[PDB]
Amino acid sequence: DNIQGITKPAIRRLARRGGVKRISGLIYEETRGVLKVFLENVIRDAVTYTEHAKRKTVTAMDVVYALKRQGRTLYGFGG
Amino acid sequence: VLRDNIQGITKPAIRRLARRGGVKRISGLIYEETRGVLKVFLENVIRDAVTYTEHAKRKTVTAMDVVYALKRQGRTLYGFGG
Amino acid sequence: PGTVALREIRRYQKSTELLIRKLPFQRLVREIAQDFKTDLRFQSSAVMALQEACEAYLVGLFEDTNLCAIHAKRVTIMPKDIQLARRIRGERA
Amino acid sequence: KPHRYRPGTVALREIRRYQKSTELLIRKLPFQRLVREIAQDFKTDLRFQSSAVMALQEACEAYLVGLFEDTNLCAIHAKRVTIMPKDIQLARRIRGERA
DNA sequence: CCGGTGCCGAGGCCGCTCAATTGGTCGTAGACAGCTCTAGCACCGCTTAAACGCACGTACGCGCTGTCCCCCGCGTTTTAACCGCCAAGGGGATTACTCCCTAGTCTCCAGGCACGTGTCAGATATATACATCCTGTGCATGTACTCGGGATATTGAT
DNA sequence: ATCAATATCCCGAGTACATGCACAGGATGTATATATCTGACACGTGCCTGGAGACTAGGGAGTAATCCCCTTGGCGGTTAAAACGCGGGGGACAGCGCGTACGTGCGTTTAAGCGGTGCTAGAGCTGTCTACGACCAATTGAGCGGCCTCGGCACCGG
């Protein structure tokens, strides 16, 4: 059990960057679901890329390639 | 009469499309707004479809051109070629 | 009242035809394409594909608009819903 | 006796404070443990580059910020200021994830 | 005076009577199966030639692994602006009707540009010798983060 | 319609790791020359997209009655926010070693070329024959009607 590592004030901070004033108290348990699901896809690709190169270490380029295949491009990590 | 053809998209047509979408009630301000939206879409496809016609040095726009234009916008169309 | 509309709703969700008259759509497409270049010629399949794609886009838009209207405890759809749907989908702002 | 602030002004203060800085919010160690346990659940005995996990963290934070922005638009559309999960479901469905 | 009892008024039962719905049959016509070459043409069989893909060591850093300290999370309290529910006024989108009109059919006409082939020539792959621009390494220093203290707002309670 | 209590911004000083530049060099960009076929240009061709005519009628534009959903306003309950104290785990520094990248050597494997030949494609008119139009008889359902039974009030009796 480590999804609880995403503490409540962390969710509050993430919400505050978005520009929301009031947070319901039951939001967190559902929001931790979204973090649970959106993260279960890139890793699906990230390990798989790793498994193509006969290597068992997840390099910083595999996650970039996964996020590119999904439609979210990021800069600054060797893209 | 000299009338713009965007008004050629009749109100009953928009109501039919909405009813196919699954809506019970339609406010009266949708009718002018939807046409505007329908403009913007056609401003992002024909523009591409003409450019391909430029690149082939042709004068007639073919169905393959519009299919390729729709393909690049993540709106792939099936059954009209390609 | 309020049930003859549902009759249509059920009827149109089964039939699969073109809900826009062909001639006005052709005139609209020609007039829109006039600005980019004068004296163009159009394949008939191109016009049919255009109309099919536009109708599919509008149907999806109205589906999302209905979801938006239901969210706000309403039954009538207003431009306040279409703008929200376009904004949150990603075609504007 | 002690000076108390109105409920809501501290909210905008935090909004302005966080919308200017660009530090990582989630604590690094819990995020690393979470991704490690998920990876082991998929494939055991895996090694992770620190740059890789920080890029996963930044991608997740960007996703969450965009999701919460859309949620805020959904909540304001319903004549409200508090965000409830129905707003998140509506946003997630219109974007085209969930359904 | 109060109470039994008839008369009338209302609630309950049952049933058609009639008007709207939906699967079944008739029927005819343009379009899915299905040869028929053909036709030339991609696909297969049969050869070699070269190179990239693969495996073995082997050098060498970048991830895991162990120890102190406070900063952020947890948990409590009160209280208040917001959520949710309810209710009434009224506007407008709905529904139905008659009347107009341009979509739809198809027919006829014809000239513009898709489309293929044939010709030929110059732009581009390719090999080799030349050489210099970009890259890893090393190192001075200064723009910027941090700490501390005094301005100017910036809110709340009388 | 202001005064206390915080929070924030501004400025100054000690401090440091990362930017920016010079150096040695090496391997990839460049100049020269050859082969050659891909694509510019011209030609005919004939498909088909564009223009106009007349007739049918499904569909749209205009009007009127109206019941309903929309919106504004008001109130009760409470779910979160703001700030206090308590408590634990994130955060900041050294030692192993196992992974990842080069280096070196080998052979399996695709590209290329050239006959060989079934094989997918197009128009042929082929003929059936499902499936789209028109008509018609099945059940389902709600809006009504007839009659009977129950209950309350006015009238007469003791």
Coordinates of C-alpha atoms in Angstrom, one line a residue, chain A residues 1 5 8 10 26 28 33 38 40 55 57 62 68 73 78:
Chain A
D1 CA 0.0 0.0 0.0
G5 CA 1.7 8.3 0.0
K8 CA -4.1 15.2 1.3
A10 CA -0.4 17.4 -1.8
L26 CA -14.3 13.1 -0.5
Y28 CA -9.2 12.9 -2.6
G33 CA -8.1 6.8 -8.6
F38 CA -3.3 7.6 -15.8
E40 CA -1.0 2.6 -15.2
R55 CA 17.6 -4.5 -20.9
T57 CA 16.3 -0.7 -16.6
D62 CA 11.3 5.3 -22.6
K68 CA 4.6 10.7 -27.2
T73 CA 4.8 15.5 -25.4
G78 CA 16.1 14.6 -24.3

